[PDB]
Amino acid sequence: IRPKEVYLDRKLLTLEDKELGSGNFGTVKKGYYQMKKVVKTVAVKILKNEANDPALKDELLAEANVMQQLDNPYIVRMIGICEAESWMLVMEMAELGPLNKYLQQNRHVKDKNIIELVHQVSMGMKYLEESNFVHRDLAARNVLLVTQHYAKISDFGLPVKWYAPECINYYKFSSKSDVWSFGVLMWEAFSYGQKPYRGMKGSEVTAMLEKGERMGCPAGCPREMYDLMNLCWTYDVENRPGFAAVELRLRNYYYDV
Numbered sequence: 001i002r003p004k005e006v007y008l009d010r011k012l013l014t015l016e017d018k019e020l021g022s023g024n025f026g027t028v029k030k031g032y033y034q035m036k037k038v039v040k041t042v043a044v045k046i047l048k049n050e051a052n053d054p055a056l057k058d059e060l061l062a063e064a065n066v067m068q069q070l071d072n073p074y075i076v077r078m079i080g081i082c083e084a085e086s087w088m089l090v091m092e093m094a095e096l097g098p099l100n101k102y103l104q105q106n107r108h109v110k111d112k113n114i115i116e117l118v119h120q121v122s123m124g125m126k127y128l129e130e131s132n133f134v135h136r137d138l139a140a141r142n143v144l145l146v147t148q149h150y151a152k153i154s155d156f157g158l159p160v161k162w163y164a165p166e167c168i169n170y171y172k173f174s175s176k177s178d179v180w181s182f183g184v185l186m187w188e189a190f191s192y193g194q195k196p197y198r199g200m201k202g203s204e205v206t207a208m209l210e211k212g213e214r215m216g217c218p219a220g221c222p223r224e225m226y227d228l229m230n231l232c233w234t235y236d237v238e239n240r241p242g243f244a245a246v247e248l249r250l251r252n253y254y255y256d257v
């Protein structure tokens with residue numbers, strides 16, 4: 001849920017002193033946005049335009065207007081934006097944090113629950129595909145959990161080990177290239193947040209994939225889920241499924257299991 005306008009009132013926003021995470025953009029802080037009867041916990045991305053870039057404002061506003069229309073629940077949605085002491089991108093909070101670190105710390109999560117989470121990710125990706133948006137950086141670190149039963153895709157475009165051969169070779173990014181990344185993501189998920197291609201460098205992964213070699217079936221991963229991973233890793237981009245086909249397969253599978 002979003003208020004009518006994209007611009008939020010800075011006086012209605014409270015930020016935590018502690019930062020959730022930093023980087024070469026700014027930082028992400030936990031916040032609280034005051035609405036009529038309730039208070040909504042939010043994750044606020046803060047952009048200090050340190051080099052006073054005149055181009056930033058236009059870029060951010062064009063993005064916010066696109067974000068205001070992206071309503072699917074399987075994505076981290078924008079609450080709004082505010083031009084205060086810094087630009088603040090007020091997003092939904094996904095309390096449990098990244099999928100990979102979550103699974104790592106919670107080895108008790110069942111295969112059924114992992115299947116549910118990966119199906120929600122394919123629902124979010126199907127939605128982005130339908131909207132002509134390519135993620136470019138789809139990975140388990142980029143799936144944030146609101147609950148153990150509610151996953152949201154973050155930081156979509158608007159990681160060589162997650163790249164489709166045509167990304168590394170011909171610099172071709174598409175939703176089908178994101179399907180390859182979704183295959184790696186499914187591997188990370190069923191592997192409980194373990195690192196893909198452990199100890200390998202990006203050049204070695206390429207050489208491995210050209211041999212027709214793929215990562216093996218994770219311990220306890222259902223066979224049909226490993227088969228779907230492997231289909232996401234179809235070398236030829238023309239025979240690799242899109243997200244509508246992947247989501248429908250996960251959808252049928254989930255409602256039987």
Ligand SMILES: COc1cc2nccc(Oc3ccc(NC(=O)c4cccn(Cc5ccccc5)c4=O)nc3)c2cc1OC
Pocket residue numbers: 020021028043044045060061063064067076078080081089090091092093094095096097098144153154155156157158
């Ligand atoms: C528990 O720990 C965490 C929970 C979190 N819960 C939700 C969001 C978080 O951070 C994010 C992730 C992505 C984006 N942003 C995005 O996903 C994003 C997607 C697309 C476009 N734009 C630009 C834009 C947004 C809004 C307006 C204008 C431009 C985006 O920022 N912003 C903040 C969290 C971070 C955490 O720790 C580090």
